Amino acid sequence: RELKTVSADCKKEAIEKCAQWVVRDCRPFSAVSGSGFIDMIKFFIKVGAEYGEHVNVEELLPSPITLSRKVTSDAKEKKALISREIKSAVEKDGASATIDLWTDNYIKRNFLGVTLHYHENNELRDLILGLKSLDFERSTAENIYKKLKAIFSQFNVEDLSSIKFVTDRGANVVKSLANNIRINCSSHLLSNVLENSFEETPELNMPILACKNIVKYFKKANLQHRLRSSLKSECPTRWNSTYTMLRSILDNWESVIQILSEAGETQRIVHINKSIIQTMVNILDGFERIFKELQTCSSPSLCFVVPSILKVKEICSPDVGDVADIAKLKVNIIKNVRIIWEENLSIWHYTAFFFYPPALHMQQEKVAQIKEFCLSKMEDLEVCPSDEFEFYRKEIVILSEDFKVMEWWNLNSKKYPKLSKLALSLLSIPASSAASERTFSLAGNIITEKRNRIGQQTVDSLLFLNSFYKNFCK
Amino acid sequence: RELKTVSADCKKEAIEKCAQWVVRDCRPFSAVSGSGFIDMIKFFIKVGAEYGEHVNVEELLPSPITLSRKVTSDAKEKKALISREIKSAVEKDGASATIDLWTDNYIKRNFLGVTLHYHENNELRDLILGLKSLDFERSTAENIYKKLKAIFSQFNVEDLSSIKFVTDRGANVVKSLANNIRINCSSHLLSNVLENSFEETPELNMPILACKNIVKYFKKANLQHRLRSSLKSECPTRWNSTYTMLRSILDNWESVIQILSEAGETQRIVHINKSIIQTMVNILDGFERIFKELQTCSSPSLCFVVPSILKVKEICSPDVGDVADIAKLKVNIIKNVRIIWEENLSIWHYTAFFFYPPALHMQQEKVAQIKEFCLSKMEDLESREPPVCPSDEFEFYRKEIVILSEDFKVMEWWNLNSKKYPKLSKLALSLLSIPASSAASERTFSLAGNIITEKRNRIGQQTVDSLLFLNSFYKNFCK
DNA sequence: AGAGAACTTCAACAAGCCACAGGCAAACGTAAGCCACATAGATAAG
DNA sequence: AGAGAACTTCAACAAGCCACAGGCAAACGTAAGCCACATAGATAAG
């Protein structure tokens, strides 16, 4: 049970040996820090101890094809083994899910994201079922649902309407998912509404044009080396694409203004206002933290919806320090939010926020709809229920910086039989498909020019095993 | 020398746990196949036996920055230890170096490439020295000269008369190299000649874009799934893409014609005469074999370009069934050869081809010029039918007749001919160590691309330079 | 030339106690300056 | 009462020889997948 520290001589031998390895095989440096690699260290040490130093190492080495075959097989056995746990989680309505479709840049396959979210014990579950490519049939949503049910049948799950789905507004996706409770992706809604608000205000375009010319010059003239922070592009696919350029402008301000002064580019900066930049940064920092709080995986994010409304309507409300253009922007933002966000928000969002222990947030008319939905869900999952609802109205809870609604409800689960189960059912719902596009990002990470011959089954096997190893290993 | 065996259960758990690691680490399956991999495994097994089982790993395994420090230290140690042998190679007049420029695609740095080749003992050493940054200077021949002097003085080299260069016709390239040896790149010149040949024949202009649009239609519309040898686009930055794409289209002709029949787009393929395609492939087969001949490094390639001139003039000889368009193409190709190839040739290639044991092939003024050049060099490097003298060495080598054996390698032939012709053999080992073109530079760039990656940004230039140098050293001095 | 066997007579060593003080000899204290590997932050690709 | 010391007799009895029955782990030929490595080969990119 006690590790035996060795003399530094074997240590130096290890250092030189691994330097030779890293140079010869030409691998990224951090691969030594891989925890699985450290497990390899333990395994080879023990086999050396139990067989000596006069062994045949080579015959113990398998072939990579056998590696791939064993990977796919073990994927099959482990997915079969966890099918039972997933079915148990689904039956009690404890599970939610998000989906999307992904494409690479080499073969352009129609890969679909299948992620299942729920909660077990005191760890918030979040599972990636598998990325199955649709192949090439006109990318029809009919084939999408066919392959979807093929995926679900791999775990013996044939019911979907009870699963709560948080997805964006893809036409075919929403068309097919109208049979399911469709929740708009809060992050995607924020990005789209922000883009709509920006496109309604040309009064920022002229400094935007100047900044775009600045960044083009920076990526062209090759002068980023003397900034300590290289300028970034927009990349509209990137979330909060304006925030990154606002940062790379305001933060680098001193160095960039000095180098444009010393490079004879005073023309590039005569059309820029600092006050507007600082006001917009002060407005957009809240938006960035809304993004990060709505992209939380190991924490519930559906309870953020109405506090997000409060924070936005406080931020978007006109102030004294705004310009006429900025006040016009704020009015446009108010119009867009009232026609999109609150228009599309519905009973699920307010009800999921309601279970937060300070239930005095929405003392307005929304309590009626929230109570009706709570009664319906109590029937679905079924001290009395309405008595529970009334006694919850008697509860007052003080916020603390480390307070969690989940632990609070579970410690009140001893007092409340089924409303706590309702809370965990609602708390297991992220407010966005951030996990879905992160799965897409991971798939992009595993794909590369040298990896253009991979098979789809191998890919979804790898990602499922990675998710299982992340979530159910202690 | 006997080796032992483990239980099958041990092998099974090895499979299980290595799969666990690789799925956790998300690494390509080629990693286990590495030779350094099994080297480290053997070291681990030896240490585990020597130390037991309840031996800690966490303390033993170092930190990545420690690794970078140790790699730089080992690189500089090998630099110091090998600079002396490399200097001996420098003044043994058998050294060949590569020079080029390359820009990154993430940070867009400017890098000057220097490597070195030499022959010692029964092996041709191929060492990649360094791809050093030019910082952000004006990128002139002065910065290039400073960088190359710094590169070589890092290995205690200050004179560059003996070194022999092969490179392209860049502006700075022709600007700086006027003071030392210069040879034009065979690959760059060959690609330029192919582009000229296809440009000067107007009749074959439209099939190029026709085939490119065919590939584009089969690409963008997700039309590559049922194609056995799927088509790909040009990527003209590469070498002879057009012929390879045409070959692939000719290969898949059956699939594509039935696909057009089933899809009602037969008008896409009916616009091209197939006989044109067979004519193109029949002409270009010898060209592609020449392509594959010139790229050799572990075997000589400088000397195998004039016999490629022989092969071209054999191919460029007029045919009977060649269309008038094909006759125009071949006449234009002959003109391009006359105006480019012999224009860019130097005495290096003639001297390299001369050492072919049946020297009777080039019995012209060429061998006389080669004799004068070799006599000058040997007077610098130092009828009597015994070798005795360099002039008599050439006189005796002239009359030699050797069979065209199929498995003939001139390397060991001259190695055992050094007993007969010592100084001429030294000239041979000097000449053969020169690749004809700069394909090694692109190989080094490919290695860099294996190093530099979208996720592998933000690496110091000295670090990567040491990595590539040490890797080349190991591929030079490890048995 | 035996042979066993016990006896005074010197008188002659000798193992067996102490007294004790003088090493060299194993092992524990500071100190100690070169390392040098371990510990937290920006930062580009995303 | 006792001495200490050699013969004399059955004697039986616990050491070694012997070696046909009954028994057993060890060795060998066979056969069924079998199945996990091992081979080239191609296929894209670079």
Author numbering:
A (entry chain C): 81 to 462, 518 to 609
B (entry chain D): 81 to 462, 513 to 609
List passages from the publication reporting this PDB structure.
The Hermes DNA transposon is a member of the eukaryotic hAT superfamily, and its transposase forms a ring-shaped tetramer of dimers. The Hermes transposase is composed of 612 amino acids and is organized in four domains. Architecturally, the Hermes transposase is unusual as it spontaneously forms a ring-shaped tetramer of dimers. All hAT transposases are predicted to contain an N-terminal BED zinc-finger domain organized around a conserved CCHH or CCHC motif that coordinates Zn2+13, but no structural information is available for Hermes as the constructs used in previous structural work lacked the first 78 amino acids.
As we were unable to generate interpretable cryo-EM data for a single Hermes assembly that bound one LE and RE transposon end at the same time, we determined the structure of the transpososome bound to two REs. Using a similar approach as described for the LE-LE version based on partial signal subtraction to focus the reconstruction on the DNAs and the Hermes dimers A and C, a reconstruction at 5.1 Å resolution was obtained and a model could be generated. The 3D class that refined best clearly showed 5’-flanks synapsed in the top A1/A2 dimer revealing two parallel DNAs. In marked contrast to the LE-LE transpososome, none of the refined 3D classes showed density corresponding to either free or bound BED domains. The 3’-ends of 8 + RE-TIR + 30 DNAs were both inserted in the C1/C2 dimer in a TIR-like fashion, suggesting that this interaction was not a function of STR/BED interactions, but a possible consequence of the particular length of the DNA used. The cryo-EM structure of the core of the RE-RE transpososome showed that the RE does not interact with any BED domain, suggesting that RE binding relies on the interaction of its TIR with one dimer in the octamer, perhaps aided by nonspecific contributions from dimer C across the octamer. By contrast, the right-end is bound to no BED domains at all.
